[PDB]
Design a binder for this molecule. Structure first.
Ligand SMILES: [Mg+2]
Ligand SMILES: [Mg+2]
Ligand SMILES: [Mg+2]
Ligand SMILES: [Mg+2]
Ligand SMILES: [Mg+2]
Ligand SMILES: [Mg+2]
Ligand SMILES: [Mg+2]
Ligand SMILES: [Mg+2]
Ligand SMILES: [Mg+2]
Ligand SMILES: [Mg+2]
Ligand SMILES: [Mg+2]
Ligand SMILES: [Mg+2]
Ligand SMILES: [Mg+2]
Ligand SMILES: [Mg+2]
Ligand SMILES: [Mg+2]
Ligand SMILES: [Mg+2]
Ligand SMILES: [Mg+2]
Ligand SMILES: [Mg+2]
Ligand SMILES: [Mg+2]
Ligand SMILES: [Mg+2]
Ligand SMILES: [Mg+2]
Ligand SMILES: [Mg+2]
Ligand SMILES: [Mg+2]
Ligand SMILES: [Mg+2]
Ligand SMILES: [Mg+2]
Ligand SMILES: [Mg+2]
Ligand SMILES: [Mg+2]
Ligand SMILES: [Mg+2]
Ligand SMILES: [Mg+2]
Ligand SMILES: [Mg+2]
Ligand SMILES: [Mg+2]
Ligand SMILES: [Mg+2]
Ligand SMILES: [Mg+2]
Lengths: 194, 195, 115, 119
RNA sequence: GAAAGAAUUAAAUUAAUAUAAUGGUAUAACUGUGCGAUAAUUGUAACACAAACGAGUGAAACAAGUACGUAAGUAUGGCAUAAUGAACAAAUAACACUGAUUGUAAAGGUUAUUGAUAACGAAUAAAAGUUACGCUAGGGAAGGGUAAUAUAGCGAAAGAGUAGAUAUUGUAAGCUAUGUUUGCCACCUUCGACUCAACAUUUCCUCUUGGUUGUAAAAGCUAAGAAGGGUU
RNA sequence: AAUAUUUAAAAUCAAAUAUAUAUAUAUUUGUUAAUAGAUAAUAUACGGAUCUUAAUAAUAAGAAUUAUUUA
RNA sequence: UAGCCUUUAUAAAUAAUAAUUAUUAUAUAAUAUAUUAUAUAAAGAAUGGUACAGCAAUUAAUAUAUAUUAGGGAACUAGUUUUUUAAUAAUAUUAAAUCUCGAAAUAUUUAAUUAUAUAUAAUAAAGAGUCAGAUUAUGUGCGAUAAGGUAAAUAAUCUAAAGGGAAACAGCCCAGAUUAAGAUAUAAAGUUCCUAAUAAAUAAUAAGUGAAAUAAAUAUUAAAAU
């Protein structure tokens, strides 16, 4: 917001914060032939909290990501010092990976076609999930990770497996458009929508 | 409700200072904003203490509690710290210890202001008078139709203050820095800045 | 108790050479903490951000459109020159040196070379 | 408390009369300075003293000090001033925010004309 | 109409800065990175700032050599402001200056370097008390001011007063008076008893008077006038 | 003539300045008193005297207080 | 030792002190909108953050039949009628030695010109005293918005200053004694007598209020605006 110029002290005064937020928010344009929603990236987050005591679990998690996805994993390092959780700073706690194009297409296809159907009690993705400007996030557990072809093929080499969050970033202006797009890609939704 | 006991993280001793004399005609705090009757200083600017303000507060509350949806607003906060020293002490040896909170009340400011469905001007007047008898200055009653005291013997009306934009005045009498910014946004400078 | 009577003497900061004043090489124009005044042209800045003239001239305080929100102090090579000089105009330069009319001095300088 | 500086809090009629004359004298000095500048301007333009004095158009001073001193809102003339501000001066440590002008040091030489609008 | 660039504008110095606080910093002084580890080098330093001295601060320019850079150029430690100590006497190295009859020495000098005098411009390598037995030369480095305290009144009246704030009473706060108290400043370096008392009134008694569901009488409480007499 | 905030020159109104010659802008000034509260110690302490006026009524007095001013 | 004072001098000497021009804009003309010229207005070349002003960011305070969060107050098988406590938003009010988004005057200070030359500044040789300060005003720290208190910051005077006024008076108002004279103009202060010197106008006071050191809250009695 801008200060009304009714007082001289408003001449060089920095502008005010947005009414409800400390951060500015984007504008929403009508959907037209040039701005249809679509998938732009997928990011997988694997933070093994039990790696606080054992650094090798980070390497195992990176290998899990590499085998599932096929891209180069990138390490995750601790940033905060929380005693109650016994989390120090500067240690390797896991791995991440970002997917685009054919590789993310394959990852989503295999998820929907193989892994999600093999979950015990799976209703879909919560309809009240995702950042308010396009993007849907949902998680997977270790037993769920065991369903991927690479792990099932060589169970022997996987005494322990780790869960991970999955963040799908799309071009949707708002979240419900992204939900429709993912439903088109066959991603079930169960909860009540906002 | 901490008007008589600010919650400063680091409690610090403060210098004596002086009660401001608003020679620029400042009317900040000298208008009715929350209620319908009010109490305002009339004598020279003075200093009020938390104990005196609390005594005035309960004096007014004795009249405000027996009312239908009656409210009292406290326009003043004791945001200055004061120190005391024992009488059996030589001058010097640094400052003393914290004694009490205090507020500097200029001539025209409004201390309390009340409203109520069953309120009546005479009742408000007696309440405010009794409350004023417990403060170290001279005080008077203010209503919504009353002028704003800008001095000991001078009043004024807020409607006389002209409303004016200042962006336009700045534009019409620019500053050297403003002209520099404007001349920096010209293409022959922007296109050659080199950064 | 613990008396509070420790303080450092005032650092003599501030402008040491005012606008229109004539200055020579090396003279200190401003002493400051940080760059409240940036150096313009014909002037340099030291470790402690001291502004000092590099050529003889006249001290001028000014503002430059290329650097908005930045005050500048500089040295004009003549009084009649506005210091925020035109951008597309040849730079005013001072040769400074003097010709060695003396035959012996010219000979020595001619025969002096680097290592 | 201890010393006796028996300075009364209010002036007398004679003191007030002298103060009025002093104010008038300063006004006269300002007026004469402006008139001299005007006559000099006329004589520089070519006219002589007689029609410089008789000139219908009077030249106003171009210096900041003289222009401000000539503005009544900055240096009001004696007849323009108020009786209050002729004899009482503004003080922020005194009851009523005023003190006798005769309690100002060297008050017969220094000049005070204006006090804050509402004081 | 659409992609990919180049970027521009608003905002931001609140994060970060090796370390307090202040000033500065996005054009970054902050952060990442390749070389590098070089300028955390050598001999003259003008001129300024600051300044009693002694010291301190910025630094153009000339010369010798390095590292980075295509180049322009940058670098004489750290974004800046603290991070410190004289001279004497010792000690180590280099220089090639003097070598007390000559020769070499010894010793001195020049250049570089080391150890701290924290009462931190550092008396000496080396030092605490007591005097009511005390001595000399000096200075003063109850009255006066103040009214926090004490005492007294006034305004207002929350509450007691079988009922009613104002017969009496008046608890936190407000406005003043005194200069009798305890203190405060530093102009000015005997408590009690005996005897004789003079003065004030803020009246204890004696005279006049108003009030008192709370003055039936008597005895009282409260208050106004009153210093003539009296007051173990 | 009666119910009757406030103690004011801000706002309004009235006089004046500087620009303006058929009128406007700007500026300067003009908004209460008396008493009570009241207050000690050698002696009343405006420095003292004393200072407020009044026809008949004579040469001839009527603030010597406060607030604005003149000669 | 520096600072403040004194004697004697030096020139390719005015370098000293004070003020003005510097700027922005308008009008009317020109010249060639851009200038130049004249007149006028504006607290008027460069530097700065005090008063004032303000609540921006920081630090603190108040309010809401407006929203988020938590325990969750007559029916009850998850979901209220609400003058329910605290925190976060929204809106409206507030202040501060170590807060300035606005911002004075004095102030610092530059070149040229003008004025001051029976006058400043700088430099050379040489000689001291001083290094216990005091009030009065205006901003402050401490003290209690006490002190003839104490600590420093601008004047001025006493110190080392006679003379007039403040009754008397180191410091306040005016004025600086080479020696006289006493005609004229006076400063501050005064003009009924003591005591040099006055006549009036318009209102108010009745209380000896007051008249050369104004004592407060409050109470009573009186004055006019609608
Ligand atoms: Mg303020
Ligand atoms: Mg300092
Ligand atoms: Mg650093
Ligand atoms: Mg900082
Ligand atoms: Mg200097
Ligand atoms: Mg030196
Ligand atoms: Mg660096
Ligand atoms: Mg030899
Ligand atoms: Mg020998
Ligand atoms: Mg040797
Ligand atoms: Mg010592
Ligand atoms: Mg020492
Ligand atoms: Mg020292
Ligand atoms: Mg010793
Ligand atoms: Mg003994
Ligand atoms: Mg009762
Ligand atoms: Mg009490
Ligand atoms: Mg009596
Ligand atoms: Mg009886
Ligand atoms: Mg007016
Ligand atoms: Mg007496
Ligand atoms: Mg000396
Ligand atoms: Mg500012
Ligand atoms: Mg300050
Ligand atoms: Mg000159
Ligand atoms: Mg001394
Ligand atoms: Mg003193
Ligand atoms: Mg003198
Ligand atoms: Mg002496
Ligand atoms: Mg004298
Ligand atoms: Mg007299
Ligand atoms: Mg005398
Ligand atoms: Mg009297």
């Amino acid at each position: 917001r801008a200060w009304s110029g009714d007082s001289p002290y408003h001449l060089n005064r920095p502008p005010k914060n947005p009414r409800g937020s400390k951060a500015q928010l984007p504008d929403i344009h009508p959907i037209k032939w040039s701005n249809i929603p679509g998938l732009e990236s997928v990011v997988i987050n694997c933070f093994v909290r039990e790696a606080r005591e054992n650094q090798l679990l980070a390497i195992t998690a990176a290998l899990q990501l590499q085998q599932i996805t096929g891209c180069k994993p990138h390490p995750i390092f601790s940033k905060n010092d929380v005693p109650t959780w016994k989390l120090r700073k500067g240690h390797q706690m896991g791995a991440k990976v970002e997917l685009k194009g054919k590789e993310m297409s394959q990852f989503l296809s295999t998820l929907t076609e193989i892994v999600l159907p093999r979950i015990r009690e799976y209703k879909g993705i919560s309809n009240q999930s995702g950042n308010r400007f396009g993007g849907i996030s949902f998680g997977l557990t270790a037993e769920d990770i065991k369903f991927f072809p690479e792990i099932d093929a060589n169970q022997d080499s996987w005494p322990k497996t780790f869960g991970m969050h999955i963040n799908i970033n799309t071009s949707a202006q708002l979240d419900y458009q992204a939900r429709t797009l993912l439903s088109g890609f066959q991603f079930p939704f169960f909860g009540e929508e906002k | 409700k901490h008007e008589y006991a600010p919650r400063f993280k680091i409690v610090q001793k403060k210098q004596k200072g002086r009660v401001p004399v608003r020679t620029g005609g400042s009317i900040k705090g000298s208008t009715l904003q929350f209620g319908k009757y009010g109490l305002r200083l009339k004598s020279e600017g003075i200093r009020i203490s938390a104990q005196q303000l609390k005594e005035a507060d309960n004096a007014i509350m004795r009249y405000v509690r027996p009312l239908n949806n009656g409210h009292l607003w406290r326009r003043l906060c004791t945001n200055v710290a004061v120190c005391i020293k024992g009488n059996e002490t030589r001058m010097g040896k640094g400052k003393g210890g914290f004694d009490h909170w205090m507020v500097r009340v200029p001539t025209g400011k409004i201390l309390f202001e009340i409203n109520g469905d069953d309120l009546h001007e005479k009742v408000a007047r007696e309440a405010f008078r009794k409350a004023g008898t417990k403060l170290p200055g001279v005080y008077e009653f203010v209503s919504l139709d009353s002028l704003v005291r800008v001095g000991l013997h001078s009043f004024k009306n807020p409607k006389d203050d002209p409303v004016k934009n200042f962006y336009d005045e700045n534009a019409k009498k620019p500053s050297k820095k403003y002209l520099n910014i404007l001349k920096s946004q010209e293409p022959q400078y922007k296109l050659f800045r080199g950064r | 108790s613990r008396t509070s009577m420790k303080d450092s003497a005032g650092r003599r900061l501030g402008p040491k050479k005012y606008e229109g004043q004539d200055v020579s090489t090396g003279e200190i124009i401003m002493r400051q903490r940080g760059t409240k005044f940036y150096p313009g042209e014909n002037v340099g800045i030291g470790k402690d951000h001291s502004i000092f003239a590099l050529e003889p001239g006249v001290v001028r305080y000014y503002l430059d459109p290329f650097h908005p929100k930045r005050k500048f102090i500089g040295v004009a090579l003549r009084r009649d020159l506005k210091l925020p000089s035109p951008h597309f105009e040849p730079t005013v330069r001072r040769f400074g040196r003097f010709e060695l009319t003396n035959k012996r001095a010219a000979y020595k300088e001619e025969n002096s070379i680097s290592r | 408390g201890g010393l006796l500086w028996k300075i009364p809090w209010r002036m007398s009629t004679h003191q007030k009369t002298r103060q009025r004359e002093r104010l008038r004298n300063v006004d006269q000095v300002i007026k004469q300075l402006t008139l001299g500048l005007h006559v000099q301007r006329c004589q520089d333009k070519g006219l002589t003293y007689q029609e410089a004095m008789e000139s219908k158009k009077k030249y106003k001073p171009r210096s900041k000090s003289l222009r401000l001193l000539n503005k009544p809102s900055v240096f009001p003339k004696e007849n323009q001033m108020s009786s209050k501000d002729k004899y009482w001066t503004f003080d922020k440590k005194a009851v009523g925010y005023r003190k006798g002008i005769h309690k100002v040091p060297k008050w017969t030489k220094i000049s005070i004309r204006k006090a804050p609008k509402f004081f």
